[PDB]
Design a protein around this nucleic acid. Structure first.
Ligand SMILES: [Zn+2]
Ligand SMILES: [Zn+2]
Ligand SMILES: [Zn+2]
Lengths: 576, 199, 47, 99, 281, 198, 159
RNA sequence: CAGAACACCUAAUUUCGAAUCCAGCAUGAGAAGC
RNA sequence: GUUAAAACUCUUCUCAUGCUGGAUUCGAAAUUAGGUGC
């Protein structure tokens, strides 16, 4: 059972409450904005109170449209646990702090900072392909190419397998993997979000205009969003050599860009190998305080100002755009510009003297043919596709094409098979005895989890079937045991280290790779690793070989399965 | 007889709150993780005994006032049946008129129960000898109970309210000496009809 | 359970005024038909 | 009135316990005793079959069930034990439905 | 839910272009097929195929048969493609060969007490996903559940405790106990019966543990009288009375001595002693 | 009968660090601070008072030389026959004095600040380690009571002696670094146990 | 025929009839009567087959005397004896692991997880009492379930 | 297609997370109708 | 084709009352906001 709490235009509340038999699952506890209007918050609270006590709040990505009502759902104490991906968790740390910061500047409050940290106490995190067993439901995440940490949620209940798509990323995405990862198994229901734009890589055109303008004697101001989009246009400046410099005048946008480069393992495979080489190179020069911002705005030698206030509404893109609006320069609108925003008036002339060019390649969501392609990759045809968000218009034309593919649509304003994931026994039942007033029978066999049916089949069945039929390093199991024992005796590997590495391994393999890479990262300004220093009389060459031994020993343990890692690590640390 | 007192008791938590897990299987399941589990339900909610705390409170204060109240806290002590607390909470002959429920929490463990660390500082070297992890209930956690007196006289309101004030003084359950269990109570009392449910 | 029982058992081997009063107590059910039957059974057994 | 038959067995709903008696002055456990209890959230079924029904048997049985919800059912009712909630599915039946 | 045998359908309990409304039932021509509608389903029993048939208007379930191209042509040209098709009434290998092609058009097939897994590992060997497991099948009165040797270990240990704490060494089987006259036994057990140290439960438990031999009674009276090292508490009921602390101990000692002296009396004699106190046994 | 109220007031004179004990409060503050302060869910700072008082009384009374057990060695069982066992508890009787926690009268924002500490290399005289903690500022006021159930004669003076030991030596953590030096103001009253009985 | 595979020690005397409380497995093999050991070995043998396809000795009286002495100083409490009964009943490798767990001097703290002795003893002898406790409770694992229960219900009845 | 506001470098790490007491009493074993 | 055959040992009555998982034990032990520039 699924409820769409405000799933029409995500203004004043949006949630997907999966009503399974044991849990009140919530997907995408988020809010949009109308850029100006007070009673809004009362309709939000009424929706939130109507949700009820949600057993698990699951965030497909980290935008406020998907994660904006989460600390309000902790203030009313309706949320139990907050599961997402780790990059999503730190992104909503910055986004909830910024949301409240604007409420304080708006003179407000929907939630408070205590609600934010109280959200991040109950916030469990798992990465892609990590099935976790919560309250009759096996929940897995799969990448959907939208932003860093964005996934689609796969919930296998006994009443059906649901795939909340979230936002599917476009083909113009360079930082992420392009093919959106999917369940290998069934999808009884797919909760799909429609598009917002229209169907074309301008890309190079950016580097064209910014060429011609910078040689003309004018800096290029590129307004952008702070989630992904600034890093998209900075990555297109990182790829092709642009001889004049780039400058980020965005504090939040810069610390999100750093948050890209510690979480490079969650980005595209071709960029996961980025070796003590930065991915954005060292081409980006970051403005830190307001005084370099003022000096750079006053400075007039042509250079990219590539920063993020969004849509010319408040931030440091503003302090640049005032003198640029007084100027040879140009504004490059690589994002959509919403209603009632000052930059929409700049994009509609109502007059910026410097040149107006918008670019439509840098889009976050996908296309109509990409939502079709998202649909056709599926191993089985879905039973029903619940188009939920988008503009109403393109929801109708996508709905018409997906009816043409002869799969069924439920629009939210226009919104009954039972799918029992049955368990059945295929073994002899007659030969049973009694010991403690229990009709029992010892049996040995094979459980076979087949799509839509868990069966318990004998040795005869397995006979019939068998008769018919990252780039992690590698080292042997005994070498792993020897090296962990030796680094434990010299106090490099500790019980807090093994506990924390176990927490990131139960988090998922790529989070543990990030943890060991972050610990073994020598800071070039100091020379310090986060490894525990060893006890003894080791010199600096030997201390460096032991740190590399710890790096290559906690890697290549990651490659093993969970049980093997627990059986190795339970000897050195008896508590997990 | 024809009337019956309903005392809706709303308890807020001020200091941390501990009440130990009483079920064997639930406790031994939690002793792989925490050494002092909070007394919890199977619906994931915090269960606190409330009748014995009220009886102990009223017993101590009525004994200090000078009333002829038996001490049922002594080991296998028989209640006589003529005390005020025998009429309220119970005697051997007759049951109590007051049927106190457990303080059922209004939230569900994962929002109010936290795993904490307590120690034993060695007094001369100022290091930690023992380290034990115990579960506790956060402050501001809301608990609900109802006290249903079957045959009300006039004192059964004020005696319960006085015992509640004593529970604000000494604490409701668990480690009352280390400062745990300090709570406040709000009382909504009504005298219902016994024949209310008969249509 | 058998042997436990059978060892247990084994150890376990080792004039008008009365008319008016009985007519009163028959109506308020103090003495009853079972009481009359068992009291008469005790009298028929002896004294 | 049928017995309240649970749908689970002992290892799922019956838990042993530790109930105490605390001295009022010394604040120490004078007595300890173990006692089984059925857990919260455990559900039970009972079928009440009324032959020769009047109009008011439904109302009286539901009213009795709200009184049982208020008081409790079973033992240790003063300590908070046995407080439950009832759901009722009523159905009229011709007695010859087995024929 | 279809139960295969013909074709039974349990919603109304029917078993397989105007519309007859029983469960909306409507017979389309095969060139005949029947389309049944219910709140939980839109089932289609097609029958056999011949070339331009009359497919219904959403056929949630499509129960067809074949023994090859025409089956798939009919699998298409049906608006809102079915959730699950069912391949019946044919040879098994040809059904699988057709079924591979219904999987290639991404449509799920199934070739022809509730049971609960209380299990927990996985393996991807061969075409199917699995987890090797040796276990137990309990057949409770409305469930059939699956367990492993940890649950058998727990009920085996419960049976071992329940069967060990059930037979003592020399009970009901065949010296140096205290001695005291019958008159002092009368006076002591009267006095210890008015105040409640010797109560009817305790006299009855003395009677069962005396019927189970003298040594069982000696063991029972010792473990009743045994003062704990830690609490300093004996398993007697407290006397009801002023008795301050030392005649408490002398009074429990009197109960100890009186019961232990009554032990060597004859079984009929201790019976004539006890029934004045506890009429039952 | 009577019971004794000891209303205890602490004013912080040097930055006070007691550590957060709740695991959910501590591993969610680890991205910010390496040493969180103990807080309530009402966001007021909690200090454990009992163990400090009992440790104080064991140290001072053992130095004076009476029969007082130690409850600080490994699994140290209390005896039951001393002044500390009578006041603060044992394996037999409970503690006659219920010592409430020390909750601050102000919430975290006014009184908790987020400070940076360092480890300086003794040779190069440069910053070798850096870690962030939380400290309670000076002048923050914490309120407790101490209730004595069966009040004996010496008990107020005994509690105040322990409250002078805690003023000199300190309460909380980082005690030898200067953290935790406090001042106590005590108002005492003897009350009857039948006071709420109208 | 039928073969019992159990040593008939721990046989009580109920009246004039010798008696044993026992749990087992009828095997239609020689109609054998096999204990729980049999089941554990054959369970693990089928586990290995399924997955493949895809102690020092002390005298009894010394055990009573040492467990007596360690009970009086409260090194071996009834919590320890109860949990040792749980870990022995679960198996022997579990009892080995539990006893090594409570006897392991932690290298960072220097503390054994036993209960400290009651009374004045030198730290060397307190350690020797700990090593004695390791030796008896490890030596207890070499015996069967019946003598272990009969040994430790004199000290913790309910264990 | 949503948040956005004189200078660096850092902000990690390590131990423990157990031990013990108690688990008893007491009452009631009948009626009555057919 | 049995001194046959016919007739339910049925109805009424809650294992309920009394008893707080309490007591013992301080998240503290280590680490200079230091290095730069009149
Ligand atoms: Zn998005
Ligand atoms: Zn009384
Ligand atoms: Zn002492």
């Amino acid at each position: 059972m699924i409820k769409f709490i405000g799933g029409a235009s995500k203004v004043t509340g949006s949630a997907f409450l999966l009503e399974t038999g044991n849990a009140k699952i919530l997907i995408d506890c988020g809010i949009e904005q109308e850029k100006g209007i007070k009673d809004n918050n009362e309709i939000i609270e009424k929706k939130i109170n109507e949700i009820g006590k949600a057993d698990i709040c699951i965030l497909t990505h980290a935008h406020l449209a998907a994660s904006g009502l989460v600390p309000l759902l902790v203030k009313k104490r309706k949320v139990n646990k907050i599961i997402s991906t780790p990059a999503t968790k730190e992104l909503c740390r910055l986004l909830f702090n910024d949301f409240q910061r604007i409420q304080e500047e708006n003179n407000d409050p929907l939630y408070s900072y205590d609600d934010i940290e109280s959200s991040f106490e109950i916030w469990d995190e798992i990465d892609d392909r990590n099935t976790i067993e919560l309250f009759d439901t096996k929940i897995t995440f799969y990448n959907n190419s939208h932003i860093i940490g964005s996934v689609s949620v796969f919930i296998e209940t006994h009443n059906g397998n649901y795939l909340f798509s979230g936002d599917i990323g476009s083909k113009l995405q360079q930082l992420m993997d392009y093919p959106p990862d999917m369940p290998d198994g069934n999808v009884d229901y797919l909760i799909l979000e429609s598009t917002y734009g229209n169907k074309s890589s301008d890309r190079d055109r950016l580097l064209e205009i910014a060429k011609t303008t910078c040689e003309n004697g004018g800096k290029v101001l590129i307004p952008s969003f702070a989630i992904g989009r600034l890093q998209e246009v900075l990555y297109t400046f990182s790829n092709y050599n642009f001889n004049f410099p780039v400058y980020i005048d965005s504090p939040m946008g810069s610390k999100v860009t750093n948050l890209i480069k510690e979480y490079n393992i969650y980005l595209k495979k071709k960029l996961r190998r980025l070796i003590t080489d930065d991915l954005f190179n060292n081409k980006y020069i970051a403005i830190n305080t307001s005084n370099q911002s003022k000096e750079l705005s006053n400075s007039k030698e042509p250079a990219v100002i590539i920063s993020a206030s969004g849509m010319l509404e408040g931030g440091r893109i503003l302090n640049h755009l005032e003198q640029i609006k007084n100027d040879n320069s140009t504004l490059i609108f690589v994002g959509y510009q919403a209603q009632n925003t000052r930059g929409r008036k700049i994009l509609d002339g109502e007059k910026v003297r410097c040149r107006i060019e918008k670019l439509n390649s840098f889009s976050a969501h996908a296309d109509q043919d990409e939502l079709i392609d998202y649909i056709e990759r599926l191993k089985y045809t879905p039973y029903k596709v619940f188009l939920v968000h988008g503009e109403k218009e393109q929801r109708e034309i996508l709905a018409k094409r997906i009816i043409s593919k002869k799969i069924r649509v439920e629009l939210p304003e226009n919104y009954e098979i039972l799918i029992e994931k049955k368990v059945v026994l295929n073994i002899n039942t007659d030969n049973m005895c009694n010991f403690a007033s229990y009709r029992l029978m010892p049996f040995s066999g094979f459980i076979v989890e087949k799509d839509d049916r868990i069966e318990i089949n004998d040795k005869n069945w397995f006979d019939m079937i068998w008769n018919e039929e990252m780039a992690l390093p590698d080292m042997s199991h005994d070498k792993i045991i020897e090296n962990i024992e030796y680094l434990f005796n010299i106090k490099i590997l500790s019980k807090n280290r093994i506990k924390e590495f176990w927490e990131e391994f139960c988090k998922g393999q790529k989070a543990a790779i990030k943890y060991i890479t972050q610990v073994h990262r020598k800071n070039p300004n100091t020379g310090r690793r986060n490894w525990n220093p060893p006890e003894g009389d080791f010199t600096d060459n030997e201390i460096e070989k032991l740190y590399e031994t710890a790096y290559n020993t906690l890697l290549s343990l990651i490659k093993y399965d969970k049980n093997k890692v627990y059986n190795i690590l339970i000897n050195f640390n008896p508590k997990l | 007889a024809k009337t019956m007192k309903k005392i809706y008791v709303t308890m807020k938590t001020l200091s941390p709150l501990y009440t130990g897990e009483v079920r064997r299987e639930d406790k031994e399941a939690a002793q792989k993780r925490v050494n002092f589990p909070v007394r919890k339900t199977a619906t994931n909610k915090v269960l606190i005994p409330f009748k014995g705390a009220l009886r102990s409170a009223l017993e101590i204060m009525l004994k200090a006032k000078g009333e002829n109240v038996c001490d049922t806290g002594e080991s296998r002590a028989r209640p006589c049946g003529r005390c005020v607390t025998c009429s309220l909470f119970g005697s051997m002959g007759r049951a109590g008129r007051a049927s106190v429920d457990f303080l059922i929490s209004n939230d569900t463990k994962e929002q109010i129960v936290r795993e904490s660390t307590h120690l034993r500082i060695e007094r001369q070297t100022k290091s930690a000898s023992d380290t034990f992890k115990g579960e506790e209930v956060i402050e501001g956690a809301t608990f609900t109970a109802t006290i249903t007196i079957s045959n009300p006289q006039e004192k059964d309101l004020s005696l319960i309210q006085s015992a509640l004030k004593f529970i604000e003084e000494n604490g409701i359950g668990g480690w009352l000496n280390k400062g745990y269990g300090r709570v406040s109570f709000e009382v909504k009392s009504e005298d219902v009809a016994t024949d209310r449910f008969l249509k | 359970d058998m042997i436990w029982n059978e060892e247990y058992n084994k150890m376990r081997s080792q004039h008008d005024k009365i008319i008016e009063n009985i007519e009163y107590l028959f109506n308020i059910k103090i003495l009853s038909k079972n009481r009359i039957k068992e009291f008469w059974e005790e009298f028929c057994k002896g004294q």
